[PDB]
Design a protein around this nucleic acid. Structure first.
Lengths: 98, 88, 46
RNA sequence: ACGCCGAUGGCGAAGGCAGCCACCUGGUCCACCCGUGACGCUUU
RNA sequence: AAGGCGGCCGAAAGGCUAGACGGUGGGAGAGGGUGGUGGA
């Protein structure tokens, strides 16, 4: 088990229901690959700095989890599938520097 | 990798007494664990020459530890060679 | 926190400027953060 | 190109190694002083 | 696989810990390998 940070940029133009679904998907995933979620953050839309999928704005997710290092790559693969997930970046958690 | 728990599991098995963590016996067992998981690692990754070099050197040190025991204490080299199902 | 790759607010500031009163060790750490933000599209490559 | 960061910088036994992420894995450093007790270095 | 050199005490056998390795706790790294994804 280890501490990672998930990070997800999702298409911004979805609807309450589409959005809720993607999030419902992400969570079974998280669950299926043995990740226990410690905490979730949803900064949502953000101006960006260069065009991603043409849209110059994305919906930002996050989650801090606990899972078997050997499945982190599998998980990321999972999460990438979805056409609304246009950016997934997992990272080993680390204490803040300074 | 190899964890502290599974490691002491190996230490208690070979310790010469309780609190022994560096006796030739333990030292050899522990390297065997390392060798073992490295060979498996290398069973795939047939292209990791660098770390394969590390195996070679691990295998060499083990021999030297053994040769040493066998030399300075035939008594202990006995069991150890056996309990580790090492040699031939 | 030179590690928090989402603080565009602060990170914005160092755009990669050469040693930025940052030290040899602070920098680099910075840089990786900055390079992580970028992928997120948070910060700009150019 | 794999920019900027990149350095009188770092790693490796040599050749050599530079986007970022994860995983597998080799070497190395400081501390303690807990264990074994010279078990080390090296030449062809 | 065959050969030199090797700290302290001892004639030697052997002993000793300061060398080596191990235990535990930290550190830096474009060291190797696999799988990915991002820009130019």
């Amino acid at each position: 088990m280890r501490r990672y940070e998930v990070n997800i940029v999702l298409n911004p133009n979805l609807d309450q229901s589409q959005l809720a679904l993607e999030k419902e998907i992400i969570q079974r995933a998280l669950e299926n690959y043995g990740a226990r979620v410690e905490k979730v953050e949803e900064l949502g839309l953000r101006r960006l700095a260069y065009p991603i999928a043409k849209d110059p704005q994305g919906y930002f997710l996050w989650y801090q989890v606990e899972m078997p290092e050997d499945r982190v790559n599998d998980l990321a693969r999972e999460l990438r599938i979805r056409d609304n997930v246009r950016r997934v970046m997992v990272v080993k958690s680390q204490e803040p520097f300074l | 990798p190899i964890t502290k728990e599974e490691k002491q599991k190996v230490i208690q098995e070979f310790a010469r007494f309780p609190g022994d963590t560096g006796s030739t016996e333990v030292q050899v067992a522990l390297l065997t664990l390392r060798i073992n998981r490295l060979s498996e690692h290398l069973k795939v990754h047939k292209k990791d020459h660098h770390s394969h070099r590390g195996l070679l050197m691990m295998v060499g040190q083990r021999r030297r530890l053994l040769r040493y025991l066998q030399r300075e204490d035939p008594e202990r080299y006995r069991e150890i060679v056996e309990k580790l199902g090492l040699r031939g | 926190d030179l590690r928090d790759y989402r603080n565009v607010e602060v990170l914005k500031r160092f755009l990669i400027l050469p040693r930025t009163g940052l030290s040899g060790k602070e920098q680099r750490i910075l840089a990786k953060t900055i390079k992580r933000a970028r992928i997120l599209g948070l910060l700009p490559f150019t």
